[PDB]
Design a protein around this ligand. Structure first.
Ligand code: AZA
Ligand code: AZA
Ligand code: AZA
Ligand code: AZA
Ligand code: AZA
Ligand code: AZA
Ligand code: AZA
Ligand code: AZA
Ligand code: AZA
Ligand code: AZA
Ligand code: AZA
Ligand code: AZA
Ligand code: CL
Ligand code: CL
Ligand code: CL
Ligand code: CL
Ligand code: NA
Ligand code: NA
Ligand code: NA
Ligand code: NA
Ligand code: ZN
Ligand code: ZN
Ligand code: ZN
Ligand code: ZN
Ligand code: ZN
Ligand code: ZN
Ligand code: ZN
Ligand code: ZN
Lengths: 295, 295, 295, 295
């Protein structure tokens, strides 16, 4: 036997950071969950009980805190790049660092129509994430995403013209509910190192905002032929609006809402044009995926 | 042996309803999860295999749908009252109906600064709930609540002057983080029946709004001496602003954020006035509860 | 306004304890999650920012650890009684202590047919719990339970003879699946204090075992007329086998498994006597409850 | 823009199947959750609203049921292979089918020391899984796994000799707790098609049993130098015992149990050799991964 692949590190590291403006009194908070996995010349820890090659996962945890103390934690693309670069530079025998960051929402509260200086609300379980892979000699590969963006439209979704054979019972429809949890990822051009990541810093927040805006507007406005057709429109628009992205990927569940035939009860009409009350289905769900790149 | 208490019904019934304005084209959606448990002269179903006294839970489910089709589902206090009243009136031997409703958020999307007619977003896992107990001959008892309202303030929370003995290690503080998930319940005066509930319908949405507004403003503005002291202020204000409530109850976790001493690493200062990076603690958590009524 | 009720403490306190037999080398582990809430003359912490009456929740946490170090953690009825008694005795102004313990399974592994001295497996998310309320001047009230015991029988469950009216669509059946998650609670006679609890210590493990055995055997062997009828049989047997219990309570979901009509596909027969493949339903679920006491 | 990758299908399809032996009366149950995603000449569904290429996800769901009715559902490697082969054979334009199956435990109950003919218990959330990728012209690729196997040993785990620098605070130890949730995957040699999968059917259950047995015995018996060293031993043994496997992969969290220093309280000794009571840590956790293949 031999080690074909190995990585190890610390997962589920919760991190909060506050910034306090001394002049204005305004405070701003950031909260994340971080995972860091390292690769390199570490196989002997597995094969020979050689712990000398192990940067302890506890030490990786310490390093996350220390790095958060001494550097910006936003945008997460930057923080992840700094953190991953640290491991490959500090340790000769560590040659890759994989850094995943889930960013949690702490949106500043408005009280009586004014933004409060130090109070925040979790508006939504929606996350902003990054996966940053820093590979020695091969730069920094960043995948940015939004996830857990849960939406529903009550009309202007259709699904007809699909294949019909002896396995098919689904009725064609020209007016259905469409609900999903959006998971959208944009893959950046490889960056050569930290300097290049830093040179593009404003683009990270701007591109997250573009992706979110395009997703919401396209979902709301597209008289959808299918989940497939709608998600493709989202992806093509995002690519058109950020040249430093190479691909956009969507993974969308179709969270079904079924009509309920009540006509057995006093002829009550609740289907088709008369459908008012529906049964949200927890499972199963359609799952529709696409990765779109440039022609 | 004998039956001392019994109730049965259908739980976790997901319900969506849409309203479509024909004139304007504006659609509005509602989504809930419902549980209904019935009580009455049903003991023989337990003791003698007498199913004749059982209104099948499947039929209870059907009835939830039918009732949602033929009645308003908002405010939930009203829907729950209608539904519970149905069971005790329809079935001579059923003498109480317990109806719990969890309302899920589907907030209308704004696209390009305009409210969209049929697209919605789940902004937050915060719920609005009701527990409605309809008891034959004893009216309708309603407990309204908000839950899952997750907030954080980064300063203007204190905790000092607590009991100190040989079990105490906690340091006094004049500046800490405070974060919680608000669960707040207001208990209405008993209503004599459906007519009286209907007569107060506007008060239900208004009182939920008051409770939420008071909670957020008090949390944001109170230079808090403790969770106890802050929650009491919330409750007293809500009672002062709705005379038809008898009590307000809060249940608040203290979701701790611990300082991280980094001074072992190059003398890095991250405690006290220099605290920037914190460790959010998943567990354990303080749990602070109060029920406040009128003097 | 005035405080009508108040309690506070520390929740979700994870605790592990190991016992090591020096002679044999056999180690035994225990893992729990504890919550402790205190009541007493504490209202001024809410109304006047008087923290002097607060035994800090952090100190309550310390006390849980210390008490676990110096006392048995098994049976949980005993540990909870010791812990709750400590708070009301140590603090003059604390008059009630509510202690909930969830016990997690760490079952000793068998390796090559022999019990291993220090390796354990979580066989099942089933829990054994206690709720212990120690009230100064009013003894110790203990509710013991098992929960999360998930079972299924593939036949010998029936449901017919239920009420049929215009809300009813459910077909009678003489052969269905029955699956549930058992939550069963036995309420002990009030104990006067710790001495009396200690005097009955062996009965706690014995009665948990009886409750579990009766539950499983009755579920397996009863040709069930309904969930109601089966659960009542369980409760009556447990009461008959422990005179120091006053009531037994069950709360059972009916976790439905629906037939799937496939006859639209090449006349495939999968209903009634030919039913082989079923659709487990995540929601909704029946919920059936009973509390049984002595005649 | 252009589609670079696309797949779609139905996820979270719950399936139960019962087998009834007419002669003996013994019934046996199987429960799974299935996902199926298809690939092929489907890009126009995304780019041109061409639904004619879509086998509806609803139809995929029907097909899962139908296939379960007409074929064995065990071992899951076989069922997944049959199901995936169906899609690529039935639909000319579908060229790959990805089938994931999570198998849920329904272990036959023993009542009074005898196996019951039709009653079952969920002993453990441990799963047995398969990922089966059927690719037209390229055979069938199967990854088998066990997951959610949660274990703890109370001694005979060590961790010393790791790298120590200015980021390191972790103390070396020669006696700690080790607890993990085992996720282990064995990757089979490519199979040319269904005939070859069928020819190896007995090996699937046998190899799952070997993997589980090796995992448990090695965990229990290895005086572990690290998670890395222990998991490697597991993998090498499994490879040695099934020549039709190419690799074994483990992903193991190190679910930390921290000592609690109580010496501030009356000099209580609870560290090192005196450690009895520990604080299980929910997060963060080490995460250790390896893929082992043949030299
Ligand atoms: O790459 C990762 N992505 C994730 O979403 C994640 N979550 N935990 N760890 C993770 N690593
Ligand atoms: O948008 C949809 N895409 C699909 O592929 C599908 N299949 N069933 N329903 C569907 N809806
Ligand atoms: O839920 C899922 N998400 C995915 O991205 C995926 N890929 N394969 N199977 C999958 N299931
Ligand atoms: O009274 C209830 N409250 C709840 O929060 C709930 N959830 N399920 N059922 C319920 N019943
Ligand atoms: O607000 C608080 N209340 C308490 O009762 C407490 N105990 N520890 N910390 C605390 N913070
Ligand atoms: O989490 C909890 N919430 C409560 O309301 C409560 N009451 N007792 N114990 C409790 N634990
Ligand atoms: O009394 C309680 N029962 C419980 O099940 C529980 N869980 N957390 N706290 C709790 N308190
Ligand atoms: O056992 C059952 N009890 C009920 O009350 C019921 N209602 N529908 N199905 C049922 N099954
Ligand atoms: O899920 C539930 N369990 C219960 O015990 C209960 N009581 N009321 N509603 C309830 N819902
Ligand atoms: O390939 C998959 N693996 C999984 O574990 C899974 N879960 N859902 N879908 C899935 N697909
Ligand atoms: O087994 C372990 N492996 C590691 O890599 C590690 N790091 N800290 N603790 C550890 N324990
Ligand atoms: O929890 C995780 N599991 C994994 O397999 C993994 N890979 N990268 N990050 C990861 N995080
Ligand atoms: Cl779909
Ligand atoms: Cl607290
Ligand atoms: Cl039921
Ligand atoms: Cl680790
Ligand atoms: Na390096
Ligand atoms: Na009645
Ligand atoms: Na006292
Ligand atoms: Na094909
Ligand atoms: Zn991770
Ligand atoms: Zn990761
Ligand atoms: Zn309920
Ligand atoms: Zn309820
Ligand atoms: Zn609790
Ligand atoms: Zn409790
Ligand atoms: Zn899937
Ligand atoms: Zn999958």
């Amino acid at each position: 036997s031999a080690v074909k692949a190995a990585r190890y590190g610390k997962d589920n590291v919760r991190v909060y950071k506050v910034h306090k403006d001394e002049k204005t009194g305004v405070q701003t908070v950031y909260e994340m969950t971080v995972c860091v996995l390292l690769e390199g010349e570490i196989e002997t820890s597995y094969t020979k009980a050689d712990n000398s090659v192990i940067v302890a996962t506890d030490s990786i945890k310490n390093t996350i805190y220390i790095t958060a103390k001494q550097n910006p934690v936003t945008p997460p693309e930057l923080f992840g790049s700094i953190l991953g670069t640290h491991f490959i530079e500090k340790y000769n025998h560590i040659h890759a660092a994989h850094v995943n960051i889930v960013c949690h929402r702490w949106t500043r509260m408005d009280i009586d129509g004014k933004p409060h200086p130090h109070s925040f609300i979790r508006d939504s379980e929606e996350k902003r994430n990054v996966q940053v892979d820093v590979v020695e000699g091969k730069g920094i590969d960043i995948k940015s995403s939004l996830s857990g963006l849960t939406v529903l439209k009550s009309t202007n979704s259709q699904f007809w013209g699909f294949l019909r054979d002896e396995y098919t019972t689904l009725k064609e429809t020209w007016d259905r509910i469409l609900s999903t949890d959006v998971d959208a990822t944009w893959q950046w051009k490889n960056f050569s190192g930290l300097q290049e990541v830093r040179s593009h810093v404003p683009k990270f927040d701007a591109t997250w905002a573009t992706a979110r805006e395009v997703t919401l507007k396209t979902f709301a406005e597209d008289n959808s032929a299918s989940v497939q057709a709608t998600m493709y429109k989202m992806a093509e628009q995002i690519l058109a609006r950020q040249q430093l992205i190479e691909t956009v990927e969507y993974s969308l569940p179709n969270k079904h809402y079924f009509e309920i035939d009540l006509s057995w009860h006093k002829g009550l009409q609740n289907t088709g044009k008369n459908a008012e009350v529906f049964a949200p289905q927890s499972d199963p769900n359609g799952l529709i995926k696409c990765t779109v790149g440039r022609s």
